[PDB]
């Protein structure tokens, strides 16, 4: 048996910050469909009439943590701090976005400062781009020379998840399944 390792993705103990989102290739395996226990489940571009010769190819599973009210940004055609500077889906996205509340895993009563998102960036991400720079951001004319200070900012900001945050501000774990839908015999 070589069942596809989705359990490794959805059930991972730790999730990445969204600026450093993880990508898992799903390949050379047989998928165990196993399904509405999820607060978001949305698919895009999956438009097939014939269902008998369906083949999923180029399957990637991306995963990360964002705020409940940011999950709306993980969709084609959206804007915001997450879609502009952290995780960008393309207009023609084909695949599904899956999310669930993880307040009891990813919040801490003192505030969890381990989860971050990129706050400063001079231009938008391209689709499926991952920016992990920690270069000090130059918000002025004077160079920073890697020293923080006025107009010289660490580009990442903490979410500070706390269990008493409003539900829209609580951490959500997100899995983005992207693929191409081809028509082919097995």
């Amino acid at each position, epitope marked *: 048996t070589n069942l596809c390792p989705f359990g490794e993705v959805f059930n991972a103990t730790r999730f990445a910050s969204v600026y450093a989102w993880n990508r898992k290739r799903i390949s050379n395996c047989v998928a165990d469909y196993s399904v509405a226990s999820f607060s978001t489940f949305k698919c895009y571009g999956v438009s097939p009439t014939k269902l008998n010769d369906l083949c999923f190819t180029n399957v990637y599973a991306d995963s990360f943590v964002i705020r409940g009210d*940011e999950v709306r940004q993980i969709a084609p055609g959206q804007t915001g701090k997450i879609a502009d500077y952290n995780y960008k889906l393309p207009d023609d996205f084909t695949g599904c976005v899956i999310a669930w509340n993880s307040n009891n895993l990813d919040s801490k009563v003192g505030g969890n400062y381990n989860y971050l998102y990129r706050l400063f960036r001079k231009s938008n991400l391209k689709p499926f781009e991952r920016d992990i720079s920690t270069e000090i951001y130059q918000a002025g004319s004077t160079p920073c020379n890697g020293v923080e200070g006025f107009n010289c900012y660490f580009p990442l900001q903490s979410y500070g998840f706390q269990p008493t945050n409003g539900v829209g501000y609580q951490p959500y774990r997100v899995v983005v399944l992207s693929f191409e839908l081809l028509h082919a015999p097995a």
Partner: antibody
Amino acid sequence: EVQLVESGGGLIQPGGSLRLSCAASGFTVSSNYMSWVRQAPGKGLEWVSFIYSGGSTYYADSVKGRFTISRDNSKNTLYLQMNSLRAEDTAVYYCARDLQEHGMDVWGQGTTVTVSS
Amino acid sequence: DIQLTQSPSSLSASVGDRVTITCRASQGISSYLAWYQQKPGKAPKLLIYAASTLQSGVPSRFSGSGSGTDFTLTISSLQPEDFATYYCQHLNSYPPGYTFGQGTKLEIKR
């Protein structure tokens, strides 16, 4: 010397247009989040709009479709285009360099907008 | 919609007194909240962000804290230069934008 200087306010009839300017010195407008905040006379602060470092723009519901925020790199200036003005847009309009979770740290002195017949 | 209700609305207090302004959120918000001081005829001045972090240059007698829906700003020993209206501010995630409290006017007793 870090400052914001607003201009462009004045008396305008209902339905008219106004364009506010915020000339920055001491930081690069095109690299920052910038917000417009207004204060009707004897009232509190109301947030109007902001533009992100990378260009996305957002608006309070009360000005949706009538106002437009923008900026000019070469003049280091922020703008607020205001159309179809109504009496309740009457306020002092402040521009501010926006650091999001770290607050609005630099403010202009304000420009006064009076909408009246 | 999310509302920030400050209390008290107004307050008179003597020099040297301890002043505490509350901001209550009508619903759960984030861990981050900012506080501004507006003197009459002047632009607001940033005092605290991230609920408790002092803005550079602000005197140590200012402090902030809070959790859940109830946040506070505190002046440990009122100096005379501390008259103003005080506003709390939350950066909302959707729709992106800011909510302000209605403000608290603090005057000096003499």
